[PDB]
UniProtKB/Swiss-Prot annotation, chains B, C, E, G, I, K:
<protein>
    <recommendedName>
        <fullName>Insulin B chain</fullName>
    </recommendedName>
</protein>
């Protein structure tokens, strides 16, 4: 999930938009 | 833009920034 | 605990600490 | 809602807890 | 609620949240 | 102290109330 | 992305996330 | 400027990006 | 250093950075 | 007090330092 | 005052605190 | 640079003034 995508790995700001409602 | 490690409170701060009014879910179990 | 006055990103911080590994949803109006 | 309540008025951690998953 | 690791500025943010008006002490030497 | 209880180890929100005035 | 309302240190946070390892300059008026 | 705009009005991440090095 | 305008949790942040390992007390009015 | 001063007016880091232990 | 480790968003928060109105540059490549 | 002086190593608040404009 997010933690893996963005914390453990790295992510863009666009990826983080995946978790918007 | 860029890619960084975003963890914990820093991750939900980034979600807040990016999503804003749309709202978001932070669901670390997945 | 005490009552809170929380705007913007301070709300998200507070949700973060409160919910922990459960996570949360942030859903503002409009 | 909670987002607006906590800002325009006050809210509790117990009320916040309702937004946990 | 939950239990997490709360360190540095994150710890005093949590103390602020929890104590608020009561005030608090942050005394890392102990 | 606090650092050991809450950073090094983990603590609840109730434990953190131990450090309120 | 959504538009932002950012004061004080929230602006600097937002610049931080946006610019990453590129970094940024913070230059307020006066 | 940007510092004042984002606070008194609104700004975008794209506008923010202009302040990156 | 420059003068500061600090509310809420921003004050606690500023105390944190200023005091370091000495720590501090946060004691608002009432 | 300091908490109120820094918010309603301005304060210095030197004034802040008085609240260190 | 003190010396601590100041990293990432915490570093630019400290720069903001210290520099304020003067503005600052955060240039991690150097 | 800053990251080395202040994150990797440690720095004072006075050192951080080196990066003011
Ligand atoms: Cl951290
Ligand atoms: Cl604010
Ligand atoms: Zn704020
Ligand atoms: Zn942090």
């Amino acid at each position: 999930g997010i933690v893996e995508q963005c914390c453990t790995s790295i992510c863009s700001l666009y990826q983080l938009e995946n978790y918007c409602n | 833009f860029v890619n960084q490690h975003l963890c914990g409170s820093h991750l939900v701060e980034a979600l807040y920034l990016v999503c804003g009014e749309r709202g978001f879910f932070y669901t670390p179990k997945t």
